């Protein structure tokens, strides 16, 4: 029925430009008010802007955080909403959502008091604003039931994938979310809890793949 | 931002919790409420004076008084663990909208479990790479919230610390990780370093020495 699909996200440097698009189906797009909402990773939702329908003359309103840098447009023929992002900054990362916007008002309240609500949302497209260059991680052993692991350090951009023993070992494996360090580079760790009797006897290898750098590393994790 | 919410609330499974949003704009506008989980789009829960969209369980309801708007979850289910956001006008009569800062709702669905803590010193390979990262692995705790403090000898360490938000393990307990990034010289310049993990008012500590 109602479908909203955002696209255009990706990597851009500070000062750069990028255009996001949201394709809509299953509703009257021509009369629909459409809103852009963003969520930086680990942070709250932020209203970016909204474009109205024909009754308000396709009027656009923007958050002060983006006014003068971001432009919202629509093509009713394509059922498409656009976000033109210019002079982007690091604070503009990351997930951008398109939402069909409803209007509510108490009819006979007698006090002018309208508000908007976001009834249908797309899944979002991720925008990373960063000056960092593509870089594969270094993989370091976290040597030791007992816990052992691999530290996947200083890579950009996300993601990295980590398996153990070529994917044959999954039970007891926990791969943590990445952290963004002050250097602009990500780091993560993957840990596995293993029988103590197996420490120097069974081999544990973490396999790290970083596609953006074509990095594939296999690190055997041995006791010290 | 003109809408304020408390960052975190807990509710017992099957019981009732109220999440509150406060702002001057709520004196003349209603709020709408959104649920957000990782990996999924926000979902509208409630809007206006008394409107719950079709498809939303009737355990979600909204209320409003004065500068305050409230989402009540009656009979919380485990699937209600999520962030909850209110939205309204940023100020009375405005053409703009804004979200509150969000409230993380924990639904307590299993007994308290204290964290196990493992602290890894820098590997020799990392030292040879001219870096020195201590890794504090925190596992098997419930509910999923911890505070981590680091100490060099006996002094609190500020810079160089990064910590992940707790992530669910396969046994449905939580794990977290914290990193202290040092140079090899800094690493070798202290007698010991300590990772201190406080969970529900109880602290577990582990220490390493170069």
Numbering used by the authors:
A (entry chain H): 1 to 52, 52A, 52B, 52C, 53 to 82, 82A, 82B, 82C, ...
B (entry chain L): 2 to 9, 11 to 95, 95A, 95B, 95C, 96 to 209
Paper passage:
Antibody 10E8 is one of the broadest monoclonal antibodies thus far identified that effectively neutralizes diverse strains of HIV-1. It targets the membrane-proximal external region (MPER) of the HIV-1 viral spike with a highly hydrophobic antigen-binding region. Here we show cis-trans conformational isomerization of the Tyr-Pro-Pro (YPP) motif in the heavy chain 3rd complementarity-determining region (CDR H3) of antibody 10E8 to be the mechanistic basis of its multipeak behavior. Overall, our results show how a conformationally dynamic cis-proline and the interaction between the CDR H3 and the CDR L1 of 10E8 appear to provide exactly the requisite degree of structural plasticity needed for a highly hydrophobic surface to recognize an MPER epitope.
We tested the influence of the di-proline motif in the CDR H3 of 10E8v4 on its SEC and HIC profiles by mutating prolines at positions 100f or 100g to alanine. Compared to the SEC of 10E8v4, mutating either of these prolines resulted in the three-peak profile of 10E8 merging into a predominantly single peak, suggesting that the prolines cause the SEC anomaly. However, these hydrogen bonds were not retained in the Pro to Ala variants, suggesting the YPP motif to be critical for coordinating these hydrogen bonds, and disruption of these hydrogen-bonding interactions correlated with the degree that the CDR H3 conformations differed from that of wild type, their reduced binding affinities, and their reduced neutralization potencies. Part of the data presented here favors the Masiero et al. proposal, as we found the P100gA mutation to reduce affinity to gp41 and neutralization potency substantially and the P100fA variant to retain reasonable neutralization potency against viruses tested. Masiero et al. propose Pro113 of 10E8v4 in a trispecific antibody (the equivalent of P100g in 10E8v4) as being the most important residue to control the isomeric states of the YPP motif of 10E8.
